Design an enzyme around this catalytic site. Structure first.
Site, short mmCIF file in Angstrom:
data_model
loop_
_atom_site.label_atom_id
_atom_site.label_comp_id
_atom_site.label_asym_id
_atom_site.label_seq_id
_atom_site.Cartn_x
_atom_site.Cartn_y
_atom_site.Cartn_z
N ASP A 1 0.83 -1.19 0.00
CA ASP A 1 0.00 0.00 0.00
C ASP A 1 0.87 1.25 0.00
OD1 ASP A 1 -2.80 1.25 0.41
OD2 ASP A 1 -1.57 2.17 1.98
N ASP B 1 -9.30 -1.02 3.89
CA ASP B 1 -9.70 -0.43 2.62
C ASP B 1 -11.03 -0.99 2.15
OD1 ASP B 1 -7.41 1.14 2.57
OD2 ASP B 1 -6.23 -0.44 1.60
N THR C 1 -4.30 4.06 -3.79
CA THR C 1 -3.17 4.90 -3.41
C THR C 1 -2.12 4.94 -4.51
OG1 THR C 1 -1.98 3.08 -2.35
CG2 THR C 1 -3.60 4.25 -1.04
N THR C 2 -1.98 3.85 -5.26
CA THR C 2 -0.96 3.78 -6.30
C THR C 2 -1.40 4.51 -7.56
OG1 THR C 2 -1.84 1.69 -7.13
CG2 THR C 2 -0.23 1.58 -5.36
#
Lengths: 514, 72, 508, 517
Positions: free
Chosen positions: D49, D380, D82-83
C-alpha cells in the site's frame, strides 16, 4: 569593527539585490495569478498568497530585503489585497535606471522624478474614479452582488456564484465598521447540503468534543449561559504523589472516592456561577463529560481558540481560564443554543446573540480539495466587497488604468523633459509590467494582449484591461473587474517611496561587524 | 527479428513440440503460430542439413584452438 | 531518508542469499566439510558449526532480504527439525537462477508463478515416491533405525549416533499411535563416555545428598508444593532492621543464617519427609532441613509431576495455596543414582509409556549441545513417521525425482512460464552439486545422470556420498520422512518469492 | 541563491515524481509487487500500500512532501487506489515536460488538465450503471473483499471475513442516513487463537475474569454495570501501611468484609445490570470471593475501555459508590460470554440493539505479522463500502474504464478542439499508463494488454469487459468481477489533477539557500 562600503559598486549591489528578492512577489496575486509554498525552519511547509504574509516569514539577508517588508506590510494592513504589487513596482523602477547609473548617469533628480510622476498619476486616478455606492444605486446591495458574483466567478465556481453572492452581501453588511478575518471565517464539511453553503449571523463552532456523550446531554437551549473556559477538566481529580497510598482497609474506599469528589466540586463551581453550556480549549475529561450529563448541561473540550474569540465579541463576553465566574459580561450568553451535526461534524450554533456581529459560513463543496478553492473563492469576495464599501471611489481592476497611465506619462516624457523622459519613461515602463505579469502568471503573451489594449486606449477609455478567466482584452468596468482608487494611490506612494530610499542611499553600515 | 517476446514465443513453441505438435510453427509475419509443410516459411531440407553440419563443426574447431600464437 | 531503487534492491536480494547459502552448503548433505564459526565480534572463541541456527543466529545478517530468509528457516527448524540448513540453500539456489531471468529481462511475476506451480509439480512427484516402510512391526522397527541413522547424521558425533538411534526407536514403538513428544525429557550432564545415552525407569531431580541426610527414601508419599526459599525469610507481620553504620553491613550478612530456621518449622508440622520445592538450597539451609527429619528436595519442576502424571495415572498441578489444589505424588522407591559425573536423586518406579527421561553423558559442553538438536530433529520426524509412515529417499535421491518430473512439466504446461519453471528445476539439481564436491565427485556427472537413471527404473538407487558413488536408498538405509522433505520445500519456495516481490527497499 | 527557472523547476518536479510513480506502478492490483520498508529504527516492513509507505518513507522533496497529504485524502475517503493517483499524475507530469519540450506553455496545459478532468468525470456518469439493491450488492462486495483478502494476506480467502465486513456497515448506515462514520466502526484485531476466527461485535469486548473454575462462571441478563466505583476493592497502583492489633481481629476482618462484599452486591443488583465491571483492578483473592457470592466481576480494565462500552450501550458510567442509578448503568442488547481465541481464556461480549456507536469486527490470528496485513485489507474494504451505501454508483475499473475515458478525453480534445487539446492528450495517454501498469507488474506483456480492450472499445462502449490480472485468460470486469465504486474512481480523477494544479501554484522557484533546506 564595523562593515561599510560606499558609492556605486555598493549602490549597484543595492539595486541588484532588491530585484532578485522581488522576483517572488512580482509573479503572484490571483486565480490565474499565484499561490505560495515555502519551507522554513523545522520543515514547516506553508501555503500563502500575500507576500507580506511570507515576507514576515522569509528571512531578510539585505537592508534591501528589510526595505520591502514594511512597505508590503503597509499595503497588507489597509486592504489585504494587492500586497505584493507595491513590492513589484518598486524594484521595477530600478531596472531601467540600472543602465543609466552603470553609465554613471545618476542624478538625485531621480527621486523627485518619482514624486512628480506620482502626483500626476494619483491625481489622474482620482479624477477618473467614480463613486459607485452613491451614483449607481441608493441601496447598493444588489450592486455589491454583481461585484461579488464576479469575484466568485474568478477563482473556482461558475454556477454556485448566484447562490453564494447574497450570502456574501448579507455577511459584509453586518461586518461593516469591522475588517476581521475571524469574524468572516468559513467552516468546512462534506455531507451536509452539498455544493451549498449557509450564512449564520452568529457564532459557529467547528471542533467540539463528543463521543463521550452528546445524546445524554441537552444539545439545545433557548437561553444558553456560555462558559468560555480554557481549563482542562480531568477524567478524575487527583490526590498527592508523595506518601500516597492503597491497601490497607480503613482509608481504602475513601481515597478512591476522594479522587472523585474534588473534580465534581470544581465542576459545580462552573455550574452555580451560571452555566448551561460549557466550552474549553483544553480537553474536558470523559468521566467529567458525563457529569455535565448529570446536571443536564452541554459540554465540549478540544476547542480551537479562534472559535472562543468569536463568542466574546458577539455576546459581549470574554474568555476565561478559571473555574469560577463573577459576572455575565465575562461569561457568554445568547437566546438560542442549537447543536447541529452537518457533515458528521458537531457544530454549536449561537443564534440570538446580543450583538450577532460575527458571520460564519458552513461550506459544503463537492470534495475536500474542491472546497479548499471554494473557501478561497468566497474569501476573495469577502476581501473585495469590504474594500468596495469603505471606498466608494472605485476604478477598474486588472491594471487597466496603468496601461493608460503608461501612455499618459510618456506623453509627459514627450512634454516635460530636460532629462526627465528617461525617468518618467522608465516610470511608465514599470507600470505596464503589472498587467504584463498578470498575463504572464496567466501564462499568455502579454505582448499580444497588452498591445491590443493601447489601441483602444488611443481612441478613448481607460477601463480596458484583461479578463483573465478567458485571457482576452476587456473593459474591466463592464467586465465588472474593480478595485477602489485609493488602493493604487496608497500603492503608488509606497512603491515610489522605497524606490526613493534605494536611490538616495549608496552605503550600508553594519556597526557590530556581522 | 520480428521484434517480439522471444521468451514467450519459444516457450509457446517449446510447449508445441513437447507433445509433438510439429505440423505448426510460428509464422513470423505476425509472430503467431501457423501452418507448416508448405507455408512460405517452411524452408528447404538441403539448407539446414548443411547449416547444422558446419556450425557444429567449426565451433568445436574454435574449441580446439587454445594454443593460439601470433607472430605477425 | 533513503529510497533504494529496484535495480539494487533486486540485486541485494540475490547477494543476500548467495552470501549465506555458501556458508551452509559445506554442511549440507553428508557434509564432506563443515562451517567453522569464528568469534571476534563478541569474544575470542572458535566454533565448529554444522548447526545452521548457530550459523544464522550467531552471525546476525545485515542484508534485510537475508533477514527474511533467516526467520522463515528458523520456524521450519523449530517444528520439523533440520530446517535452517535445507530451506536456506534451496532459496539461495533459486535466486542465482532468477538473475539469469532478469538478465533475460523476465517479468518478475512470471518468476513468482513459475516456481509456484513447479512447487506443486514437485510435491506430487515427491508424493509418488513416498512409500510406507513402517507397515508391519518388524518393518516399523527397521524403518526408524535407518531414518535415525540419517537424521542424526550431517552433524558432528563421535560414537553417539548409533546409541541415540536405538534408544529413540524404542521410545516411538511403545506408544503405537502417537509419537513421544509429550513428557520425555532431555537431560544433559557431565559424563565420562562419548557414547552413552540410556532411558530412565522413573525420573530424576538434581539432589546431591550431603551433610547427614539418608541416601534412600522408601515407601514414598510426596507432598508437592511451589512455596520455597533461597536465603530469605522475613516474619509474617514483623521485620528486623540492622543498619545505622558501616559495621552493620557485616552483621546484616550474618542474619541470613537465622532466616533459614523459620521455613523448617513449617515443614516439620507436616511430618512428610518427601517435600519437593521449586526453589534451591545451599550448604547452609541443608543442615537445617535434614536435622528436623523432613527432607527438602530442590530443583523441582512441572516436568517431574507431568512425567508422573501419565504413567502412574495422576495429574500435573500447581499454585500451592491449599494442598488439595496441587495433585500429590506417590512412589515406591526413592534412590540416588550416579549418572556421569553428577549425583542426582531419582524417583524410581513405574515407567515405560507416554513419559520417559533421557539422560546424556559427555564432559564437553560443545558435544552435548550438538547432540541435543540432532536428537531434537529426529523425535519430531520419527513422530511424523507415526503421522505418515511414507518415507522418501534421503541424500538427494528424492531431489532428482522432483527435478525429473518438474522439468517435463516445465516443457508442456506453460507457454511463457517455462523459463521460470525451469529455474526451479535447475536449482533443484544444484543441491547435488554442493555435496558432490564434498565427497569429491564431479557435480556435472552427478546431477543429470542419476536423475534420468533412477526415475526410469530402480528409484531406490540414489546418492551414496559416504562413498562418493551411487547406492541404494532403502538397502543402505539412506531414507528420511516424506514429511520433512515436504515441509522444507514450501519454506524455501515462499521466502525466495517473498523477497522477489520486493522491488522497492526503502530505508528510513 | 540558486533559482531553478521553469524547466529547471520542472526537472526537480520530474525526479521525485518519476521516482514515486515508478514505485507505485509496480504495485497496482493483486499482481502488485510488494513494497519493502526499513524503518528509521531499522525495522523491516513489507506492505503493498502506498499510503502506508508514503507515510513511512522520509520524504525529501516538494513533490515527495506533497504526497503524504495527497494520499491522506484518498485513503481516508476511498481506501484502495493509493498507487493509481500517483501513476496517473506523474504520467501527466512527464508528458507535460514533453509538451514544454514541444514549447507548449506549462500554464495552458494546467488550465486544460482541469477541463480534461471534467470530461472524464462526465464520462463516468455514463459508465457502469449506479443501481445496486441492498441485499444483492453485498455479494459483489463479498467478491470485492475476496479479491483484497484472497491474494495478498491469505492465499485462499477467509470466507467469514468478507461476509462479516459487509454486515458491520449496515449496522451503522441505517442509523446514519445511509452513511457510515469510521469512528462508529473499528477494525479490531487480537491474535491468540486461530487465524480463521473472525467475529462481529456490536459493542466492545473485554476479557472476562474468573479466578477459579470451582467458583461459578456466570453470564446473565442483557444489562451491564459500567462502573468506575468499587464493586470489588480497586488498585490505583500504590501502597498504604498494614497494621492489625491481633490475629483474631484479622479473623473477624474476613467475616467483616464478607458482609461488605454482600453490600456491594445488594446495592448494584437492586438497580439492575448484574455484570459488574470496575476500572481499577485487584488480585484473585476477593475476586473469587465475589464469584462465590454470586455476581461476576471484571478486573484490571483499561482506562478508555469504560468509555467505549458506555457509548456502545449509549448510557453513562457510575462515578461513585454513593451515587447509584440505572441511567449511569449500561443499556445493552445482549451480554454473553464467548471464549477468547480457542485456548487461553474467555471474553465478555456486550452487544447492543440500541446504539451502534462502536461496531467492531473482531478477528483473531495465529500470527502477529499477518493480522495488520489482514487488517490493512480490511481497512480499505470498509472504506469502499462507505461509497456504495450513500449512492450505489459503481465502476468496472482495472482496465475497462481507463481505456474508455482515454477514448473520450482524446475525443474531447477533438470535439473541444482548442489549446487544451494537448492537455487533454496529456491526460488521455496518461490514462493508458494505468492498465499498462496492471499488466506491467503482472507477468503479461502490457503492450499486448492495451491493444485488446482497445479493440473492445471499437466493439463495445462503456465496458464491463476489461483486462484480467489473475491470468485466467478471461478478460472481463463483470465475469472477472473486478468492480469498484464510481465515487472512488471519480475521486482519483480529482486527486491526480489536484497535484499537477498544486505544483503550478506560484511562479516562485527562487530560494535564499533555504526553501527546501
Amino acid at each position: 569593527g564595523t562593515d561599510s562600503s560606499q558609492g556605486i559598486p555598493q549602490l549597484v549591489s543595492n539595486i541588484s539585490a532588491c530585484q532578485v528578492i522581488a522576483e517572488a512577489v512580482r509573479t503572484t496575486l490571483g486565480p490565474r495569478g499565484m499561490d505560495k509554498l515555502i519551507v522554513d525552519g523545522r520543515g514547516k511547509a506553508t501555503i500563502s498568497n500575500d507576500g507580506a504574509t511570507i515576507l514576515k516569514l522569509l528571512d531578510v539577508v539585505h537592508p534591501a530585503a528589510k526595505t520591502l517588508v514594511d512597505i508590503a506590510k503597509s499595503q497588507d494592513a489597509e486592504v489585504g489585497d494587492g500586497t505584493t504589487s507595491v513590492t513589484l513596482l518598486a524594484a521595477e523602477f530600478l531596472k531601467q535606471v540600472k543602465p543609466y547609473v552603470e553609465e554613471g548617469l545618476h542624478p538625485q533628480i531621480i527621486i523627485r522624478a518619482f514624486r512628480t510622476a506620482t502626483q500626476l498619476a494619483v491625481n489622474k486616478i482620482k479624477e477618473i474614479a467614480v463613486t459607485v455606492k452613491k451614483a449607481d444605486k441608493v441601496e447598493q446591495r444588489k450592486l455589491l452582488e454583481k461585484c461579488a458574483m464576479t469575484a466568485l466567478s474568478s477563482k473556482l465556481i461558475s454556477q454556485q456564484k448566484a447562490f453564494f453572492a447574497k450570502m456574501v452581501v448579507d455577511a459584509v453588511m453586518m461586518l461593516d465598521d469591522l475588517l476581521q478575518l475571524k469574524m468572516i471565517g468559513i467552516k468546512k464539511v462534506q455531507g451536509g447540503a452539498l455544493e451549498d453553503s449557509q450564512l449564520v449571523a452568529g457564532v459557529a463552532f467547528k471542533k467540539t468534543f463528543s463521543y463521550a456523550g452528546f445524546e445524554m446531554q441537552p444539545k439545545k437551549y433557548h437561553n444558553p449561559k456560555i462558559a468560555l473556559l480554557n481549563v482542562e477538566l480531568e477524567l478524575k481529580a487527583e490526590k498527592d504523589n508523595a506518601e500516597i497510598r492503597v491497601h490497607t482497609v480503613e482509608d481504602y474506599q475513601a481515597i478512591v472516592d476522594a479522587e472523585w469528589n474534588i473534580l465534581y466540586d470544581k465542576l459545580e463551581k462552573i455550574h452555580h456561577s451560571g452555566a448551561k453550556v460549557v466550552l474549553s480549549k483544553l480537553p474536558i475529561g470523559d468521566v467529567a463529560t458525563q457529569y455535565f450529563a448529570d446536571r443536564d448541561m452541554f459540554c465540549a473540550g478540544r476547542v480551537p481558540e479562534e472559535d472562543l474569540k468569536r463568542t466574546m465579541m458577539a455576546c459581549g463576553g470574554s474568555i476565561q481560564t478559571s473555574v469560577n465566574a463573577l459576572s455575565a459580561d465575562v461569561l457568554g450568553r445568547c437566546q438560542v443554543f442549537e447543536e447541529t451535526q452537518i457533515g458528521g461534524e458537531r457544530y454549536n450554533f449561537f443564534t440570538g446573540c446580543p450583538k450577532a456581529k460575527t458571520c460564519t459560513f458552513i461550506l459544503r463543496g463537492g470534495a475536500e480539495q474542491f472546497m479548499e478553492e471554494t473557501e478561497r473563492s468566497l474569501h476573495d469576495a469577502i476581501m473585495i466587497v469590504r474594500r468596495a464599501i469603505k471606498n466608494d471611489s472605485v476604478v477598474a481592476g486588472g491594471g487597466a488604468i496603468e496601461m493608460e497611465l503608461s501612455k499618459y506619462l510618456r506623453d509627459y516624457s514627450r512634454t516635460i523633459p530636460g532629462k526627465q523622459q528617461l525617468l518618467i519613461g522608465a516610470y511608465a515602463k514599470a507600470l505596464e509590467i503589472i498587467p504584463r505579469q498578470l498575463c504572464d502568471n496567466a501564462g499568455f503573451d502579454a505582448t499580444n494582449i497588452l498591445n491590443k489594449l493601447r489601441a483602444r486606449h488611443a481612441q478613448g477609455g481607460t477601463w480596458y484591461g484583461v479578463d483573465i478567466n478567458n485571457e482576452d482584452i476587456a473593459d474591466n468596468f463592464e467586465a465588472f473587474v474593480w478595485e477602489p482608487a485609493m488602493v493604487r494611490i496608497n500603492a503608488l506612494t509606497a512603491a515610489s517611496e522605497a524606490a526613493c530610499l534605494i536611490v538616495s542611499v549608496d552605503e550600508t553600515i553594519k556597526n557590530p561587524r556581522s | 527479428n520480428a521484434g517480439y517476446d522471444s521468451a514467450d514465443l519459444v516457450a509457446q513453441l517449446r510447449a508445441a513440440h513437447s507433445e509433438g505438435n510439429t505440423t505448426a510453427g510460428l509464422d513470423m509475419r505476425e509472430g503467431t503460430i501457423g501452418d507448416m509443410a508448405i507455408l512460405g516459411i517452411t524452408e528447404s531440407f538441403q539448407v539446414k542439413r548443411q547449416v547444422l553440419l558446419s556450425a557444429a563443426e567449426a565451433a568445436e574447431v574454435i574449441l580446439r584452438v587454445d594454443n593460439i600464437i601470433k607472430a605477425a | 531518508a533513503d529510497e533504494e531503487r529496484a535495480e539494487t534492491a533486486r540485486l541485494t536480494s540475490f547477494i543476500g542469499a548467495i552470501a549465506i547459502g555458501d556458508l551452509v552448503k559445506s554442511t549440507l548433505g553428508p557434509k564432506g566439510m563443515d562451517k567453522i564459526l569464528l568469534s571476534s565480534g563478541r569474544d575470542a572463541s572458535l566454533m565448529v558449526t554444522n548447526d545452521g541456527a548457530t550459523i544464522l543466529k550467531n552471525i546476525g545478517v545485515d542484508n534485510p532480504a537475508a533477514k527474511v530468509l533467516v526467520d522463515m528457516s528458523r520456524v521450519q527448524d523449530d517444528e520439523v527439525g533440520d530446517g535452517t540448513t535445507s530451506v536456506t540453500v534451496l532459496a539461495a539456489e533459486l535466486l542465482r537462477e532468477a538473475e539469469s531471468l532478469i538478465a533475460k529481462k523476465i517479468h518478475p511475476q512470471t518468476i513468482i508463478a513459475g516456481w509456484r506451480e513447479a512447487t506443486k509439480a514437485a510435491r506430487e512427484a515427491l508424493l509418488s515416491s513416498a512409500v510406507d516402510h513402517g507397515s508391519d512391526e518388524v518393518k516399523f522397527r527397521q524403518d526408524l533405525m535407518n531414518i535415525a541413522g540419517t537424521t542424526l547424521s550431517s552433524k558432528l558425533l563421535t560414537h553417539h549416533k548409533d546409541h541415540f538411534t536405538k534408544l529413540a526407536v524404542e521410545a516411538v514403538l511403545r506408544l503405537k499411535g502417537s509419537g513421544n513428544l509429550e513428557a520425555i525429557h532431555i537431560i544433559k550432564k557431565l559424563g565420562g563416555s562419548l557414547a552413552d545415552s540410556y532411558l530412565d525407569e522413573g525420573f530424576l531431580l538434581d539432589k546431591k545428598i550431603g551433610v547427614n541426610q539418608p541416601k534412600r527414601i522408601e515407601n514414598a508419599k510426596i507432598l508437592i508444593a511451589n512455596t520455597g526459599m533461597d536465603t530469605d525469610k522475613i516474619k509474617i507481620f514483623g521485620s528486623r532492621v540492622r543498619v545505622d553504620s558501616t559495621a552493620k553491613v557485616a552483621e546484616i550478612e550474618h542474619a541470613e543464617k537465622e532466616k533459614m530456621k523459620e521455613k523448617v518449622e513449617r515443614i516439620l508440622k507436616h511430618g512428610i519427609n518427601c517435600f519437593i520445592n521449586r526453589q534451591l538450597i545451599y550448604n547452609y539451609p541443608e543442615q537445617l532441613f535434614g536435622a528436623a527429619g523432613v527432607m527438602a528436595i530442590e530443583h523441582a519442576d512441572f516436568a517431574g509431576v507431568e512425567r508422573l502424571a501419565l504413567v502412574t495415572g495422576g495429574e500435573i498441578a500447581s499454585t500451592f495455596d491449599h494442598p488439595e489444589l496441587v495433585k500429590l505424588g506417590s512412589c515406591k522407591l526413592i534412590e540416588e543414582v550416579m549418572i556421569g559425573e553428577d549425583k542426582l536423586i531419582h524417583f524410581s518406579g513405574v515407567a515405560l509409556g507416554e513419559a520417559c527421561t533421557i539422560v546424556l553423558r559427555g564432559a564437553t559442553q560443545q558435544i552435548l549441545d550438538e547432540a541435543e538438536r540432532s536428537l531434537h530433529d529426529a523425535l519430531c520426524v520419527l513422530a511424523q513417521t507415526v503421522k505418515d509412515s511414507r518415507t522418501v529417499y534421503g541424500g538427494g535421491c528424492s531431489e532428482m525425482l522432483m527435478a525429473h518430473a518438474v522439468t517435463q512439466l516445465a516443457n508442456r504446461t506453460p507457454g511463457k512460464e517455462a523459463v521460470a519453471m525451469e529455474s526451479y528445476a535447475k536449482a533443484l539439481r544444484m543441491l547435488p552439486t554442493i555435496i558432490a564436491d564434498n565427497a569429491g565427485y564431479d557435480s556435472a556427472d552427478l546431477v543429470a545422470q542419476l536423475r534420468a537413471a533412477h526415475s526410469e527404473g530402480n528409484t531406490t538407487a540414489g546418492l551414496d556420498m559416504r562413498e562418493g558413488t551411487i547406492g541404494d536408498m532403502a538397502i543402505l538405509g539412506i531414507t528420511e520422512s516424506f514429511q520433512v522433505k515436504r515441509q522444507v520445500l514450501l519454506s524455501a519456495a515462499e521466502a525466495a518469492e517473498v523477497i522477489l516481490r520486493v522491488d522497492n527497499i526503502i530505508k528510513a | 541563491k540558486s533559482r531553478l527557472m521553469g524547466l529547471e523547476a520542472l526537472k526537480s518536479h520530474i525526479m521525485a515524481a518519476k521516482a514515486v510513480a515508478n514505485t507505485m506502478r509496480t504495485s497496482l492490483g493483486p499482481n502488485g509487487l510488494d513494497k519493502m520498508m526499513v524503518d528509521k529504527d531499522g525495522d523491516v516492513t513489507v506492505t503493498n500500500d502506498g499510503a502506508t509507505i508514503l507515510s513511512m518513507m522520509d520524504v525529501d522533496h516538494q513533490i515527495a512532501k506533497l504526497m503524504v497529504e495527497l494520499s491522506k485524502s484518498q485513503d481516508d475517503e476511498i481506501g484502495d487506489g493509493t498507487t493509481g493517483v500517483v501513476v496517473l499524475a506523474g504520467a501527466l507530469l512527464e508528458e507535460a515536460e514533453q509538451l514544454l519540450d514541444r514549447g507548449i506553455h506549462p500554464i495552458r496545459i494546467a488550465d486544460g488538465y482541469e477541463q480534461a478532468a471534467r470530461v472524464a468525470i462526465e464520462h463516468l456518469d455514463k459508465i457502469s450503471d449506479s443501481v445496486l439493491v441492498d441485499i444483492k450488492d453485498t455479494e459483489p462486495l463479498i467478491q470485492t473483499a475476496k479479491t483484497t483478502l484472497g491474494s495478498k494476506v491469505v492465499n485462499s480467502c477467509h470466507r467469514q471475513m468478507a461476509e462479516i465486513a459487509v454486515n458491520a456497515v449496515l449496522t451503522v448506515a441505517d442509523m446514519e442516513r445511509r452513511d457510515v462514520d469510521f469512528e462508529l466502526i473499528k477494525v479490531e484485531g487480537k491474535v491468540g487463537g486461530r487465524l480463521e476466527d473472525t467475529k462481529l461485535i456490536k459493542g466492545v469486548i473485554v476479557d472476562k475474569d474468573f479466578s477459579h473454575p470451582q467458583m461459578p462462571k456466570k453470564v446473565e441478563d442483557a444489562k451491564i454495570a459500567i462502573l468506575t466505583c468499587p464493586f470489588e476493592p480497586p488498585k490505583p497502583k500504590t501502597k498504604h501501611k498494614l497494621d492489625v492489633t491481633s490475629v483474631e481481629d484479622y479473623k473477624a476482618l474476613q467475616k467483616y468484609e464478607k458482609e461488605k462484599f454482600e453490600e456491594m452486591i445488594q446495592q448494584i443488583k437492586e438497580t439492575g445490570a448484574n455484570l459488574a465491571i470496575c476500572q481499577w483492578g485487584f488480585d484473585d483473592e476477593a475476586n473469587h470471593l465475589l464469584l462465590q457470592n454470586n455476581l461476576p466481576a471484571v478486573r484490571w480494565v483499561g482506562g478508555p475501555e469504560i468509555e467505549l462500552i458506555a457509548i456502545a450501550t449509549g448510557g453513562r458510567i457510575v462515578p461513585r459508590f454513593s451515587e447509584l442509578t440505572a441511567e449511569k448503568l449500561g443499556f445493552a442488547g445482549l451480554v454473553q460470554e464467548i471464549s477468547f481465541g480457542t485456548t487461553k481464556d474467555k471474553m465478555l461480549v456486550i452487544e447492543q440493539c440500541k446504539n451502534s456507536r462502536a461496531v467492531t469486527i473482531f478477528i483473531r490470528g495465529g500470527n502477529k505479522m499477518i493480522i495488520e496485513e489482514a487488517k490493512r485489507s480490511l481497512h480499505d474494504a470498509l472504506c469502499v463500502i462507505r461509497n456504495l451505501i450513500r449512492d450505489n454508483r459503481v465502476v468496472y475499473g482495472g482496465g475497462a474504464a481507463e481505456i474508455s475515458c482515454a477514448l473520450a478525453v482524446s475525443q474531447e480534445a477533438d470535439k473541444c478542439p482548442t489549446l487544451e487539446q494537448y492537455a487533454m492528450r496529456a491526460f488521455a495517454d496518461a490514462l493508458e499508463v494505468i492498465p499498462m501498469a496492471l499488466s506491467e507488474n503482472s507477468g503479461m506483456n502490457p503492450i499486448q494488454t492495451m491493444t485488446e480492450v482497445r479493440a473492445r472499445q471499437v466493439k463495445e462502449m462503456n465496458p464491463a469487459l476489461g483486462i484480467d490480472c489473475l491470468h485466467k485468460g478471461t478478460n472481463d470486469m463483470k465475469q472477472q468481477h473486478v468492480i469498484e465504486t464510481l465515487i472512488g474512481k471519480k475521486q482519483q480523477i480529482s486527486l491526480a489533477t489536484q497535484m499537477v494544479r498544486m505544483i503550478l501554484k506560484i511562479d516562485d522557484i527562487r530560494k535564499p539557500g533555504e526553501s527546501e533546506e
